[model samples]
Target: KVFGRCELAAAMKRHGLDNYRGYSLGNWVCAAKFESNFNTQATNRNTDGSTDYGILQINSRWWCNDGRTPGSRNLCNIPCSALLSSDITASVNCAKKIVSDGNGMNAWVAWRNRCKGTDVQAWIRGCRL
Candidate 1:
């Protein structure tokens, strides 16, 4: 099941994900909501034969690995399964690395398509953070 928005907001704050490397908490929260609906176990097979993994939906093209696939850049050096876990530490760290690469939240289509140029604060609405 997906996590509640408020709880997800709290988790982002707990992980220090509300702001970093030039991306805002709102962008992260909004991107995550649209990417996987806050479901840690979320996974989507893409038409290109690659797949999207976890809450942030990192792509297999250059990040995590699917056991059956070969030649993944695997920059995160993590099994895609880890991203599916309730513990998001590894995923969050990996996301940090991605953002740090310089494109910021633009690395995520979810962010571009839904969160970009919008009132990102709405994503964290009613949250204690």
Candidate 2:
């Protein structure tokens, strides 16, 4: 069976983030639902000449510009759809890296704690994770 947004949400829930806090899971999902309806294979080019791809909306150049081969190359390029074609875990891990840079989930929790009632954008910028 093919996976979809609901599946991804379920997968994330399984990871113990039911509220989808701090890392903007709800925001991300809302964006995807509006733009691509949660299609992991979605791809688009921003006006800045960057490509947004996949479920987590990863930019291809960010991963490729460094020429660092992704542990899962299939999920590392433009058009995140390739990631949907394989393991969802890889995509989730990649998103985690992009947002947290290996920082534990606590980083997200802390951000949520400090920024819940404030300006989300500024809170994200101020967050170290």
Candidate 3:
């Protein structure tokens, strides 16, 4: 189940990520691992009472009102009717954009270095492409 969930298909579809492999996958997996352990519905309450949710740990309260509703809890505000819909992908992509500054791979690169280890940021800084 872990493999099935974390594999590129689900990950890419969830993030609307395409042309991904090798190092890209590595970075995305690192963020997913750090955030929710790849649990799409994962949620947690911080010391300040703020909540974080989803595979990327998007704080729904800031992004969507679903954080306040039990049925919609743990999901993005966009209606999906089913899991892994375009809306969810849009939400994840939005967060990725903020993290990457519009560079999808750069976002992954940031996750790999900044979030993964101390040298990770340096490595990303040195990455030319």
Candidate No. with top lDDT: 1
Runs in model 3 lying further than 4 Å from the true structure: 1-6, 13-23, 67-91, 100-114, 118-129
Q: Write the per-residue lDDT of candidate 3 for residues 23-109, one digit (tens) a residue.
A: 343455556666666656566754445455556655543444543534333323443222223234654555554455444444433
lDDT of 1 by residue, 91-112 (tens): 8999989998878888897798
Worst 10 residues of 1 by lDDT: 64-73
lDDT of each: 0.86, 0.47, 0.46
Model 2 steric clash pairs: 41-81, 54-80
- TM-scores for every candidate against the unseen true structure: 0.93, 0.50, 0.49
What ranges in model 1 sit over 4 Å off? none
Error of 1 at 115 (Å): 0.5
Please write out the lDDT profile of model 2 over residues 13-57, one tens digit for every residue: 565443343545443333434444566666666555655555545
lDDT minimum window of 10 residues, candidate 2: 120-129
Judged by whole-model lDDT over C-alpha atoms, candidate 3 comes out at: 0.46
lDDT of 1 at 40: 93
Better of 1 and 2 by lDDT: 1
